[PDB]
C-alpha cells in the first residue's frame, strides 16, 4: 500500500451490512482495499453490494452467523481463499447489545452477547493470524466502545465484553509483534447509525460530547483505515476513541 492508502491490501470486516461496519467497508474500499464482509441478513448484504460496487468499491460478501464456531471457521476458510492466503486487515466490528440491567440478564442473554462481542472477535483473530502473518504487513483493528471503559445504562454486560476485548487487544499487540502484526482498538462513542428513557439516555451522551453531536459512520471509519495505512507503522496496542470528546468529559 502507499503511505496514505490501502492499495493492494485485502481486508475482512465483520458486520459490514450497515451502520459503522458499512462505513468501514466503504472507507477501506475507497482507499483501494478489496473488502470481504458479512452479516446474518441475506437481503441487506446484496443491497450493500449493489451500492458498494456502484461507487466502484471492490467488495465481496456472504451470509454469516458469528455466534457459531463452525460458521466462523468456515468464514475464514472462505475469505482465506478469496485473498489467496494473504490477509492484510481484520476488523472485528461485529457486536450486539441487550438492554437489561446486569441482574436481569438471563443465561441465554449472557452466553449470546459474550459469543458475538468477544469470543467471535477473539476466535476470528486466531483463525486470521496465519494469513495476517503471511501478508507480511498485518493489522487487526477491534471495534470497541466508550462503554468498554466507562459506565453506560443497560450496558453492564455489553461493557464487560468490550473491556475484555480491549485487554486482549493490548496483549495481542505484544504477542503478535514478531509476526509484524499491529493490533489496535477503536472505541466509538455515539455514532449516528424511541423509548422515552432511551431517548434521554442517548441525549445525555450527545450532551456530554464536546462537539455536542453524534458521529457519522465515516468519521469512525476514518480512524480504522488510518491505523491500517503504512503511515501508522509505530501505532499498536492502543484503544483510540472517536467520540467527539465524550471520553474526556466529566462536568461539561
Sign of the Cα pseudo-torsion (10, 76, 155, 19, in order): positive
Look at the block and give the residue holding cell 449516528: 192
Catalytic residue among 110, 154, 158, 241: 158
Question: Is 158 an annotated catalytic residue?
Answer: yes
Binding-site positions for NADP(+) read: 17-40, 191-193
Binding-site positions read: 17-40, 145, 191-193
40 and 63 Cβ atoms separated by less than 8 Å: yes
Binding-site positions for substrate read: 145
Q: Mind telling me the catalytic residues?
A: 158
Amino acid at each position: 500500500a502507499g503511505r496514505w492508502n490501502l492499495e493492494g491490501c485485502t481486508a475482512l470486516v465483520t458486520g459490514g451490512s450497515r451502520g459503522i461496519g458499512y462505513g468501514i467497508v466503504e472507507e477501506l474500499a475507497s482507499l483501494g482495499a478489496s473488502v470481504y464482509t458479512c452479516s446474518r441478513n441475506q437481503k441487506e448484504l446484496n443491497d450493500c453490494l449493489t451500492q458498494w460496487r456502484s461507487k466502484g468499491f471492490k467488495v465481496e460478501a456472504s451470509v454469516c452467523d458469528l455466534s457459531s464456531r463452525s460458521e466462523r471457521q468456515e468464514l475464514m476458510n472462505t475469505v482465506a481463499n478469496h485473498f489467496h492466503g494473504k490477509l492484510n486487515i481484520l476488523v472485528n466490528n461485529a457486536g450486539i447489545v441487550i438492554y437489561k440491567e446486569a441482574k436481569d440478564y438471563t443465561v441465554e442473554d449472557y452466553s449470546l452477547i459474550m459469543s458475538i462481542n468477544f469470543e467471535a472477535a477473539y476466535h476470528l483473530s486466531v483463525l486470521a493470524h496465519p494469513f495476517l502473518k503471511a501478508s507480511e504487513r498485518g493489522n487487526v483493528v477491534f471495534i470497541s466502545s466508550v462503554s468498554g471503559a466507562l459506565a453506560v445504562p443497560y450496558e453492564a454486560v455489553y461493557g464487560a465484553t468490550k473491556g475484555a476485548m480491549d485487554q486482549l487487544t493490548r496483549c495481542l499487540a505484544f504477542e503478535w509483534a514478531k509476526d509484524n502484526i499491529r493490533v489496535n482498538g477503536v472505541g466509538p462513542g455515539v455514532i449516528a447509525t424511541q423509548d422515552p428513557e432511551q431517548k434521554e439516555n442517548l441525549n445525555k451522551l450527545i450532551d456530554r460530547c464536546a462537539l455536542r453531536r453524534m458521529g457519522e459512520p465515516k468519521e469512525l471509519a476514518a480512524m480504522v483505515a488510518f491505523l491500517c495505512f503504512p503511515a501508522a507503522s509505530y501505532v499498536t496496542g492502543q484503544i483510540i476513541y472517536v467520540d467527539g470528546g465524550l471520553m474526556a468529559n466529566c462536568g461539561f
